[PDB]
């Protein structure tokens, strides 16, 4: 009706003063911050931190718990629900990582929500504009519907492999920008499909189907040994940070910036085609927000940890070695791409110049941090024996 | 060379064919049962049209709390007992927001089809928004509250209390510590459709009943996200329905899982709701019985029952226990008063007349009670007394449920009065249910929780409540209170004084 | 000092851990621990209260030495013992497959997390285990699930019936 | 204190008890609709209408003024407030006009916010990236420093053109699309800034002071003509909507679109620039947005004036005679640009193709709404004879 | 490869450049002085960053407004009489936000300086905000409200009564009519200075006051971009200070914004406040005198000293006419309450006394009369009285000032009641002070504004009415009453019964 029927006691005279007479003078404690007690990684408290750390609750026995014994109920067998003997890797604290962008769900959202309505108005003013008609016909119908295709599974792969890891994270901090990571790749897999389907509605003839890109990656040979290091980071790591460090450290860095930065975004624009660079922007800052966070917690709280840094270093170190391998002959079968390009696109020296900034890079911001000596002569070389 | 753009459901409809095959794509879980390749999800959704609507509900919820409410200073118009009430109710709710997290990731590996893990993907993303609204409400009293302790550092205040315990059960390890599927029931067929999604609703009820306007705010927007959940839970069965192995175990897993989450939630929600609130909404006993007999025991479950889910061969015992279980628990929650991390009230006079009224009964045992305690100086500092020593006095052992971690005391209680105790390779064990009972004869192995008094055997109070930081910033006053008044409230000397000292009650059977 | 989260137990054993200092001994002291505390076959309840942060400790030394003692495809492939993980994943997972009722199952799963745990085998291969081995414990434990009366059932599990009220 | 002093009616018992007790059972009114007595453009009435038709207090003397009168205070001399005077276009109501994107304040600021948040993280994905390393030197120094900066002064110089009209309007649907259309220039002008002020950043011998781009603007040959028409579109119009009408329909929708996206939209990235597409995909967008409203202004409102159709439409012929004039001229003198660039980067055949474009464009979504007949050949022409 | 970026500030430091010189680049309006080129703006603002700053305000606002606020039915619970205020309040504001968009539009093209342009460009942006949360405030009290009528229709219905003339004159056509730097007086260095940003913020006082959460969460935002307006005006005085016409024509066309402005609300905006409210919060006396004589007239107005800025030389004036304006106004106001797209309500027993005791004297004018009305039947429809037959009795013309449109009453009012007519060319002109009689003896062809006497003259009351929508959705009943309550509403047909013929009060002279 017009006042309606349930009382509320914040306006409601008579509930009212019955709280307001139950009130005390003052507040009975003025410490009006709530996680006080959290030692602060930057100046004062950012309220990222107030609402995430310690969210898990983790015992004492698991590096940096407050809580005290056992779990209440475990798995068949005995094992526990979260547990030191789920990760290689060892720490003085689960919870001294923290995403240098202080990324909890609100903002999070909030970014990607801006992300895709301007994504929605970039389209629809590229379509309006008709923009379409300068992009190179081959490049659209070969390379972005088959190839740039293809690529949404190996991004789609390495979002899966994160599903483990949203279980057996051990700390609030760390699952959070696990999930975050995860979420940005099925993200990315999803907007090259997006615009897949966006090329469906502007040019005639286009098939937004997925058939010919998933045969590609699933049979062809430029993405063979990708598929084959995708379908090992995935599903044959069970250790939630060898998962995450390879992915993001490893594989990622090299074969995924090098097809993402030195292939798509580099090629492109040569023939016409401002669509796909408009997609990769998200990818590359995605990448470079992921990459903060990868850095802070196998670097910066792992990697340099009080107790365990050397420790840490010489697993990291074994899993680089580990992966570097099946990633580098990843990059050699795409190297058989660049056969299928028009002649003059690009030759030998730009790719392999190309190779290196990627390597460079990786090492810089990578094996360098645990001292893995990485040849990169070496590695280039080794890739490029892929090109024909 | 019209205006054009692609949406959401456009993506989906390719969304299946995102997965393919290889030798080792599989689940790394262990399972009793296979989730079918082609399970499809209710809601199509990608990642940047679920951050998108998201975000529109956040800013409308932020927007409420950071203007027009903290102007209307709704922090402080609430009743002290509900201010300590939001301490429990949105920190508790938090960790099986959280454990959710976890929980629905483990959903997400078992899942073989791409739209079935999409779907475990989105609440995933969801329950990191509910930890962080959880968070949020008790970040929010901190700040803008009557009273700041407990609601400031609850992660670490909670472990001093035994009603944590059993919230970690149904909360946290219930809902990742399993078979991805006996997960999924206590999470998802259980938890929240017939606990969760009823809870959140009525506890805005409550708090607006309270002057509690914040909480409406946040919980109400929690609500809307649900629905997908629920789907998520509906799904799990479907997918699952047509594999030999469900006939054989699906309703072992599901009645597990209801009696799991109904042992803690009977008597605790209850308890909070009658216990903790001023101006009450409606009697547990009506709302429970609705709740899991009518909406979910009924409606919500026989709408599975083409999938060979049946009602819980245990959904008798839990009615017949569930009319004096929250009654009977807070005598012990009340008593034990010191070792929580909110402040807690006798029931007044009005209050006494409520519940006579509902349960007829209830003065005779629990009414008198409470006057004789009171009568004793329970409210008192000076006192010297706690509820406590009264159990002692008239040799009322309090257990600890080795299984769900619930307190009881067999010769005091109203509702259940079965104790079973039984020694196996050196150690003691205290069962208050023929199921929880069977479920560690069975499971040995998983049910290893050591109880308060196991580890708090031969300490001091006061110690234990020092070395865990129940202490307000004075650095003398406890968290924890008797009673919900601004003046003469107790100290860590006055709880020394009592010189109480912890001692397993087992040890005392040969 | 009897504290929760610090205490003379827990210092006692942080002092016996600095000791180790040779993979073999401190490897087989991490192994013999987990007999002696841990899982309801536990040889003893003496340290109920710490043993689990105990471990830890003990689990921490045990790995730093074992990365510093294994070469690169060892700290991978091989337990702290020296054994082949692959052929101690698959001989384990062969007799629980063979694992007559869940009796015997439930022997196998529980002993193989006490002997095998993470810092002995590698966590791939571990966790590996963990999946197969709950699977058949769990399929064998929940057929027929509630057939048993609880008066047998007591009897299965050898328990000793000390108090009953009802 | 706690409590505070002030007292709330909404919460106070003694205040909200008073309160309560005057209101009525129920409303008053059943119609709870702001604005209901406006004509829906669309199915039924939107915020967008509710909110703001109706807001500029004209009388009945200006077409479809509600008001009645003369104003209440004029200019010395005895000008009105506002008046038909201000402009040779009539029509029989104002407020007819609708953006079609329904865009009131809030829609507006979130939707660029959006923008302005996204560009920030772009920016700083793109630096981490290291995506400058493919940029070529020349292009960047000279093309996009000189250049692309002096273009700045061009939709500066077009954002003035609107502070006439934000004064005369004579509706408020009409003065609020104005008012975004001269504001999203301001913006452009300050993002080409924006992105010399980040490659000076980046690029350790780039300046970004504005000498340079300006000298080139003020007293190069490029755009002599260029500022010669935005120097009278601006000042020496007069007429708001001859203003709009001509700096939209005409001027910028010929060499603005020529410039923006048949030159540096189209080379740079074949001189591996993503950085400039990314900001132009902007002045597109919102071009694009800006269009819609143009159109449905000048030709669905007034073009189609069912009383003044065929008088206002030999205006704007009128006026798109008078000014594709300069338009046509400014064309001719960025012709000269071609010239200036490296050897091989693009020939006669391509932008023949692009100018036939930008016309063909124009000729589709503004000159044929007004039937003014122009010849594609004769201007395409025209414009060419400005090369070596 | 650091991650880097570009602010505001860094590409606003170059902004100033982005002008360029040629010759026709000057104001295409009339004015008598000159900004000088070289003036700088306080905030380093491009218009992207701009949008973000607003983009955030409008969250919480808007977030507040449909969560928190609607669902503690805010829009109801506010008094009839400040529901009925606000209809006046917030769409009156609206056309001063309106017309302020024209008005920095022409100072935008007035200003030479890019950075100038560029302030002034902001404030046009933020006056179109501005416009539409006006807008909105009416459009959330239609929507929730108790009485939508006038909050439905402002827009139109406005245009009967004589209050929205004078309105008109102070935020439309005084904001947008004549030199650049007079409209720059009139609306920023008087209008928001003096009056608007003081105002603002009173008005969510009294709307607190009143139950009314909806205006301050609102009107509190707005009030949040008035610094910059400020500078806005300020920067106008420092941009012409330098040229010799300043010395000769600034302090005339301040002294005439500012006798224009305070003209209408010293009268205005007192009743408003006092009359349209149950609950009070501060008497219009002791207010006035605060914001325009110490505040603005002293310390504000000081600080322009330095530039050749002197106070008002009708400042003396304004303070003695003032007293009683506001409460001589609500006589004519009540009296002719048939004209209004609102509900007037006469001071109840409380009120009167609050009247009193802080307008000593109040009772036996204003309270006597209102009781006598009151007494009447003025508020019962079967009386057939309506007070302006009270005034026509007892020979009490009311009259229309040709130049601020106030309406004014020499015979009866306590304040004022000098009067002069003059005629010219066949047209007479009634003047109320000696100011604007000045203004039109100077400027006669600036002020030609036909009064409501004029226009309706001949006209039966109800026809106008009728005429103009002034009906509710049942095409019935009055839109404005003579009193608040819920029953005994007024139709057309109450009116027309009166037969009452508008007359034009001049002619009496002939
Ligand atoms: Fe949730
Ligand atoms: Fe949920
Ligand atoms: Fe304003
Ligand atoms: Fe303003």
């Not at chain 1, 016909?137 to 949203?166: C, K, M, V």
């Not at chain 1, 993200?187 to 098939?207: C, N, T, Y």
């Not at chain 2, 930081?469 to 009592?498: C, E, F, M, N, Y």
Request: negative net charge; contains cysteine.
């Amino acid at each position: 009706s017009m006042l309606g029927e349930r009382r509320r006691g914040l306006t409601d005279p008579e509930m009212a003063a019955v709280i307001l007479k139950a009130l005390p003078e003052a507040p009975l404690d003025g410490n009006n911050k709530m996680g006080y007690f959290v030692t602060p990684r930057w100046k004062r408290l950012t309220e990222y931190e107030a609402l995430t750390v310690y969210a898990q609750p983790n015992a004492d026995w698991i590096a940096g718990g407050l809580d005290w014994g056992d779990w209440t109920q475990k798995f068949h067998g005995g094992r526990p629900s979260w547990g030191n003997e789920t990760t290689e890797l060892r720490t003085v604290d689960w919870f001294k990582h923290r995403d240098p962008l202080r990324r909890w769900h609100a903002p999070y959202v909030k970014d990607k929500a801006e992300e895709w309505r301007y994504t929605d108005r970039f389209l629809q003013g590229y379509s309006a504009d008709g923009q379409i008609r300068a992009m190179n016909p081959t490049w659209r119908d070969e390379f972005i519907n088959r190839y740039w295709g293809a690529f949404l599974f190996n991004e789609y792969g390495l979002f899966n492999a994160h599903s483990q890891g949203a279980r057996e994270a051990l700390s609030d901090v760390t699952r959070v920008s696990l999930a975050f990571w995860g979420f940005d790749k099925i993200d990315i897999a999803q907007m090259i499909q997006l615009e897949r389907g966006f090329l469906a509605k502007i040019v005639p003839g286009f098939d937004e189907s997925t058939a010919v890109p998933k045969a590609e990656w699933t049979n062809g040979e430029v993405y063979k040994s990708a598929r084959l290091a995708v379908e090992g980071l995935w599903q044959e790591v069970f250790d939630w940070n060898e998962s995450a460090f390879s992915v993001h450290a490893v594989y990622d860095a090299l074969f995924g910036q090098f097809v993402r930065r030195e292939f798509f975004q580099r090629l492109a624009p040569r023939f016409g085609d401002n669509l796909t660079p408009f997609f990769i922007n998200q990818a590359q800052t995605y990448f470079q927000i992921a990459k903060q966070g990868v850095q802070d917690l196998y670097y910066n709280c792992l990697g340099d940890d009080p107790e365990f840094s050397d420790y840490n270093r010489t697993v990291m170190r074994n899993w680089t070695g580990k992966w570097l391998e099946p990633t580098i002959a990843a990059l050699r079968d795409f190297m058989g791409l660049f056969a299928k390009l028009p002649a003059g696109t690009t030759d030998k020296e730009e790719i392999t110049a190309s190779l290196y900034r990627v390597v460079d890079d990786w090492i810089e911001d990578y094996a360098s941090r645990i001292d893995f000596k990485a040849d990169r002569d070496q590695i280039v070389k080794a890739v490029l024996a892929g090109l024909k | 060379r019209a205006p054009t753009s692609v949406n959401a459901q456009e993506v989906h409809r390719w969304l299946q064919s995102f997965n393919w095959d290889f030798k080792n794509n599989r689940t790394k879980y262990a399972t009793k049962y296979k989730m079918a390749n082609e399970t499809k999800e209710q809601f199509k959704l990608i990642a940047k049209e679920y951050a998108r609507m998201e975000a529109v509900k956040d800013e409308r919820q932020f927007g409420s709390l950071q203007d027009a409410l903290t102007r209307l200073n709704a922090g402080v118009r609430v009743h002290p007992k509900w201010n300590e009430t939001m301490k429990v109710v949105s920190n508790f709710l938090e960790v099986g927001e959280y454990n959710a997290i976890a929980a629905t990731g483990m959903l997400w590996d078992s899942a073989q089809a791409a739209e079935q893990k999409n779907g475990y993907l989105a609440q995933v993303l969801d329950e990191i928004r509910h930890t962080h609204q959880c968070a949020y409400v008790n970040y929010y009293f901190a700040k803008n509250g009557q009273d700041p302790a407990g609601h400031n550092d609850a992660r670490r205040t909670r472990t001093i209390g035994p009603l944590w315990k059993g919230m970690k059960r149904v909360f946290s390890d219930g809902f990742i510590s399993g078979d991805a599927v006996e997960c999924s029931l206590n999470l998802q067929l259980v938890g929240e459709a017939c606990f969760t999604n009823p809870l959140i609703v009525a506890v805005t009820e409550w708090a607006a009943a309270n002057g509690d306007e914040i909480t409406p705010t946040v919980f109400l927007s929690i609500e809307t996200d649900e629905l997908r959940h629920m789907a998520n839970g509906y799904q799990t069965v479907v997918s699952i329905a047509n594999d030999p192995a469900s006939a054989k175990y699906l309703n072992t897993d599901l009645n597990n899982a209801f009696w799991t989450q109904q042992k803690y939630f009977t008597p605790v929600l209850g308890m909070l709701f009658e216990y903790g609130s001023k101006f009450k909404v409606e009697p547990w006993v009506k709302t429970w019985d609705r709740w899991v007999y009518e909406d979910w025991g009924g409606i919500w479950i026989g709408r599975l029952g083409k999938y060979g889910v049946e009602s819980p061969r245990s959904l008798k015992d839990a009615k017949q226990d569930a009319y004096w279980a929250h009654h009977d628990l807070y005598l012990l929650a009340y008593a034990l008063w010191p070792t929580g991390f909110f402040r807690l009230a006798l029931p007044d006079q009005e209050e006494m007349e409520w519940f006579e009224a509902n349960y007829p009964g209830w003065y005779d045992h629990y009414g008198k009670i409470y006057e004789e305690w009171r009568a004793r100086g329970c409210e008192d500092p000076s006192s010297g007394f706690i509820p406590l020593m009264w159990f002692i006095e008239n040799n009322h052992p309090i257990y600890i449920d080795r299984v769900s971690q619930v307190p009881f005391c067999p010769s005091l209680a109203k509702g259940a009065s079965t104790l079973r105790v039984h020694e196996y390779n050196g150690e003691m064990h205290t069962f208050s249910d023929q199921w929880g009972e069977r479920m560690w004869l069975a499971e040995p192995e998983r049910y290893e929780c050591q109880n308060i008094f196991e580890q708090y055997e031969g300490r001091e109070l006061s110690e234990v409540i020092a070395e865990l930081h129940g202490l307000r910033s004075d650095g003398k006053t406890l968290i924890a209170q008797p009673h919900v008044r601004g003046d003469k409230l107790w100290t860590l000397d006055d709880i020394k004084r009592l010189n109480c000292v912890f001692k397993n009650p087992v040890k005392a059977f040969n | 000092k009897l504290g929760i989260h610090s205490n003379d137990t827990r210092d006692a054993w942080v002092n016996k851990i600095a000791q180790l200092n040779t993979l073999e001994k401190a490897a087989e002291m991490l192994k013999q621990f987990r007999m002696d505390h841990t899982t309801p076959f536990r040889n003893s309840y003496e340290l109920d209260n710490d043993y689990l942060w105990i471990e830890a400790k003990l689990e921490e030394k045990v790995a730093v030495l074992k990365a510093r003692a294994f070469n690169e495809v060892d700290f991978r492939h091989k337990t702290a013992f020296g054994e082949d993980a692959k052929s101690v994943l698959d001989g384990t997972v062969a007799k629980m497959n063979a694992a007559k009722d869940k009796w015997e199952a439930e022997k196998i799963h529980i002993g193989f997390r006490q002997a095998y745990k993470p810092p002995i085998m590698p966590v791939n291969y571990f966790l590996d285990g963990e999946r197969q081995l709950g699977t058949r414990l769990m399929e064998l434990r929940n057929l027929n699930y509630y057939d048993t009366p609880l008066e047998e059932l007591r009897k299965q599990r050898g328990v000793r019936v000390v108090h009953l009220q009802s």
